[PDB]
C-alpha cells in the first residue's frame, strides 16, 4: 500500500520485544520499506486461502499473542534480506530486489513452513510438536533461501538435486542465524520444535545421524518417501559443510575447517555460478571445488579443505 515508513514495536514468539518497520495509511500494516521493494507479511487467519491480507493494526504496537508470529516472520525476513545484501551483495531472492512475502496464522495446528513458489508460508504448530514456526530464524532462512535457489540453481526438489536444495536451505538459514548472533548453532528449527522437550531440533549439521539422517554417501535413503528423501539426504551435505566450517575428523578422515564465512562464499558462488537444476552430490563437490579455486587458487587450503569434507561424506 501507499503511505508513510514508520517504526512498530512488539514481541516475538519467544517474548523478546524488537522494533519492526512498517506503514501507515489509515492503520499501520506490516510493510518495511526501508528494504528493497518491500518487505509484506499477511494474516491467513487459520486458513490455506494465499496470501491473506496485508497484516493491518490500529495502535503500531504489536504485543497480543496472536501478533507475534507475524512480528517474527517480518522481522527475520529483514534480517535474511540485510544478510545476502550485506554478505553476498544480493538484493533479495531474485537479485533484483523483488518484493518478500509472508503469511502467518496459515492452516490450523500446522507443523510446516514452505516457500510455495511465490511467497513464505508459516503454520502455527500444534503446539505440542511446534510452536509458531516464523519464531526460528534459521526456519525463516531456509524458506527465503528456497526462493534465492529457484532463481539461481533452480535444484528440482527430488532425490539428490532435492537434498542439495534443502541444504542450501539449512546453510543459509544457519549463517543467517550466526549473522543475527542470537544463540547461533548448527541445529535446525530448534527455537520452535517441541516447546516442552529441551536441547533437540529438526536436523543437525553437525551430528544428522542424531535425528534420523545419513552423514555418509553410503547411507544415503533411496526409496520414494520426502520426494526421495530431500529432508533425509540433506544431511549428507550439511555434515559436508559443517566439516568445511568447523573442521573435524569423520569416519576417520581429518578436514581443517575455513570457517563459516568462508563457507558462505563458496557455497553461495557455487549455488549462483555452477549449480543446475539437475546437479548430484558429485557435481555439488565439482562446483564447490571450483568455487574454492575460483575464491582462493587451486593450491589453497580452502580447495583441499573442501576436498577432505566431501571425502569425508563419501561423495567423490
Ligand atoms: C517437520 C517438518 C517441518 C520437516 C520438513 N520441513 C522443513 O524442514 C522446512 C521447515 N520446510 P520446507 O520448506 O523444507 C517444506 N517444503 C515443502 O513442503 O516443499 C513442498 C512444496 C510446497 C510448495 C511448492 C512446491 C513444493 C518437511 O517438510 O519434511
Ligand atoms: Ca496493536
Ligand atoms: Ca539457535
Ligand atoms: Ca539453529
Ligand atoms: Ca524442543
Ligand atoms: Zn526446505
Given at each position: 500500500i501507499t503511505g508513510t515508513s514508520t ?15 512498517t506503514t501507515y495509511s489509515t492503520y499501520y500494516y506490516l510493510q518495511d520499506n526501508?528494504?528493497?521493494?518491500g518487505?509484506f507479511t499477511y ?10 491480507s496485508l497484516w493491518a493494526d ?41 518484493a ?217
Amino acid at each position: 500500500i501507499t503511505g508513510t515508513s514508520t517504526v512498530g514495536v512488539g514481541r516475538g514468539v519467544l517474548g523478546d520485544q524488537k522494533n519492526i518497520n512498517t506503514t501507515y495509511s489509515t492503520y499501520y500494516y506490516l510493510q518495511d520499506n526501508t528494504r528493497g521493494n518491500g518487505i509484506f507479511t499477511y494474516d491467513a487467519k487459520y486458513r490455506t486461502t494465499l496470501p491473506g491480507s496485508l497484516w493491518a493494526d490500529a495502535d503500531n504496537q504489536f504485543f497480543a499473542s496472536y501478533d507475534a508470529p507475524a512480528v517474527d516472520a517480518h522481522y527475520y525476513a529483514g534480517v535474511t534480506y540485510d544478510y545476502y545484501k550485506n554478505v553476498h551483495n544480493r538484493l533479495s531472492y531474485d537479485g533484483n530486489n523483488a518484493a518478500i512475502r509472508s503469511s502467518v496464522h496459515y492452516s490450523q495446528g500446522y507443523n510446516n513452513a514452505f516457500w510455495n513458489g511465490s511467497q513464505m508460508v508459516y503454520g502455527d504448530g500444534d503446539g505440542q510438536t511446534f510452536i509458531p514456526l516464523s519464531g526460528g530464524i534459521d526456519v525463516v532462512a531456509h524458506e527465503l533461501t528456497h526462493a534465492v535457489t529457484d532463481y539461481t540453481a533452480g535444484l528440482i526438489y527430488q532425490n539428490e538435486s532435492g537434498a542439495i536444495n534443502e541444504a542450501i536451505s539449512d546453510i543459509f538459514g544457519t549463517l543467517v542465524e550466526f549473522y543475527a548472533n542470537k544463540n547461533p548453532d548448527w541445529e535446525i528449527g530448534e527455537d520452535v520444535y517441541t516447546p516442552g522437550i529441551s536441547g533437540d531440533s529438526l536436523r543437525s549439521m553437525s551430528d544428522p545421524a542424531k535425528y534420523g539422517d545419513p552423514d555418509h554417501y553410503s547411507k544415503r535413503y533411496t526409496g520414494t518417501q520426502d520426494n526421495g528423501g530431500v529432508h533425509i539426504n540433506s544431511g549428507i551435505i550439511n555434515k559436508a559443510a559443517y566439516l568445511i566450517s568447523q573442521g573435524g575428523t569423520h569416519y576417520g578422515v581429518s578436514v581443517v575447517g575455513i570457517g563459516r564465512d568462508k563457507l558462505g562464499k563458496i557455497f553461495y558462488r557455487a549455488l549462483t555460478q555452477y549449480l543446475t537444476p539437475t546437479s548430484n552430490f558429485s557435481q555439488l563437490r565439482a562446483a564447490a571445488v571450483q568455487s574454492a579455486t575460483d575464491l582462493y587458487g587451486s593450491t589453497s587450503q580452502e580447495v583441499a579443505s573442501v576436498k577432505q569434507a566431501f571425502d569425508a561424506v563419501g561423495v567423490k
